[PDB]
Amino acid sequence: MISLIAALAVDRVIGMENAMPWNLPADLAWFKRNTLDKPVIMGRHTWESIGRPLPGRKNIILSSQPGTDDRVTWVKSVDEAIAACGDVPEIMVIGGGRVYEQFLPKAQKLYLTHIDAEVEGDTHFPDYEPDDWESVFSEFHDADAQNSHSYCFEILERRLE
Amino acid sequence: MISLIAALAVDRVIGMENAMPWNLPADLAWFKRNTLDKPVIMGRHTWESIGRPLPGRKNIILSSQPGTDDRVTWVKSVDEAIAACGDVPEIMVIGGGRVYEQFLPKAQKLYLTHIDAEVEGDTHFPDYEPDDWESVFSEFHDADAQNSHSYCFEILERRLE
Ligand SMILES: CCc1nc(N)nc(N)c1C#C[C@H](C)c1cc2c(c(-c3ccc(CN)cc3)c1)OCO2
Ligand SMILES: CCc1nc(N)nc(N)c1C#C[C@H](C)c1cc2c(c(-c3ccc(CN)cc3)c1)OCO2
């Protein structure tokens, strides 16, 4: 199945990891832990930010533009992106805002990092209906030496019921 | 012992409950639950906001001004406020910003509600040193019908070690 994983500031603002507070080391280790050995789907700007593939897994870029790097797989539609992952237990959609919006209908699981911080931003995570999603896990953490703000991991699963 | 209980928006902004998002019904029930049958200490503006005593417990107002309501106890110093609670297991300090600051050194426990919302505000909860406080409990909640933002209860205890 298809999962979205995203780090969210207040009012569900999202942004690229190079900047602060998305540079919470704890979130980076959470992200690595939940995408390890799974295929990842991302949009072109996310691919541009990261600059090179995430290791040891299929990296798929969803884009209307022809590909410019042969280390990853380029596709033009959502169904092409899904089919390119093959038969696997879980597909991870890792951003950005437009890709989250396209994949949210088919997604069955969300891995959210709620970061207790203010950031100015244009792009928000999709507005998932609280009614169709069941929170099944949450884990709060205080700000500490390495992490500049408090943050809460959460996992939700679609109430297909 | 002395405990501070407070609802905090991002960057530790605090405000009176009449306004939103401090009007999270879930926080109100959390507040009632943790102050029931305990003496409460508050500053004059908090007393002014609430307009009448919290029922079934000693209400102490810390203020440099002479009292104007005989249903509560008025005192002028922190030690007077503590002594007026008598011999009890737990004293609850319920605001506002100046009272939290005065009582934080003697406090041994914090009940914090982290509300995932933006509010403009002048007054912040005191900047407790993460080093002297151990988080011993946290419980995250999604926004729902009755609660307009997500929120996380947390309890910390002083590392007097
Ligand atoms: C972790 C963030 C993060 N947290 C959560 N919860 N969900 C997410 N979907 C992402 C993300 C992201 C995108 C793909 C992104 C964007 C980037 C990145 C990186 C990056 C990732 C791993 C490593 C390993 N060293 C280095 C960089 C990643 O680097 C510059 O822009
Ligand atoms: C609950 C907020 C709240 N949450 C948390 N975590 N910590 C807190 N220290 C307070 C608070 C507060 C102050 C005392 C306050 C200020 C107010 C209040 C009320 C009020 C309280 C109970 C009831 C019962 N119906 C009604 C009103 C309370 O009403 C107008 O201004």
Residue numbers in the entry:
A (entry chain A), B (entry chain A): 1 to 161
Question: What's written in the study?
Answer:
Two plasmid-encoded dihydrofolate reductase (DHFR) isoforms, DfrA1 and DfrA5, that give rise to high levels of resistance in Gram-negative bacteria were structurally and biochemically characterized to reveal the mechanism of TMP resistance and to support phylogenic groupings for drug development against antibiotic resistant pathogens. TMP is a selective inhibitor of bacterial dihydrofolate reductase (DHFR), which catalyzes the NADPH-dependent reduction of dihydrofolate (DHF) to tetrahydrofolate (THF), a necessary step for the recycling of reduced folate cofactors. Trimethoprim resistance in Enterobacteriaceae occurs almost exclusively through the acquisition of plasmid-associated dfr genes that encode intrinsically insensitive DHFR enzymes. Expectedly, all three enzymes form the stereotypical DHFR fold with an eight-stranded β-sheet, four α-helices (B, C, E, and F) and three catalytic loops (the Met20, F-G, and G-H loops).
Crystals of EcDHFR complexed with UCP1223 and UCP1228 diffracted to 2.1 Å and 1.9 Å, and crystallized in the occluded conformation with the Met20 loop occupying the NADPH binding site. Like TMP, the PLA binding mode is dictated through hydrogen bonding with Asp27EcDHFR or Glu28DfrA1/DfrA5, and the propargyl linker forms π–π interactions with Phe31. However, unlike TMP, the bicyclic moiety forms van der Waals contacts with helix C (residues 43–50). Interestingly, the UCP1223 had a distinctly stabilizing effect across all three enzymes, agreeing well with our crystal structures where a racemic mixture of this ligand is likely adopting different binding poses for an optimal configuration.
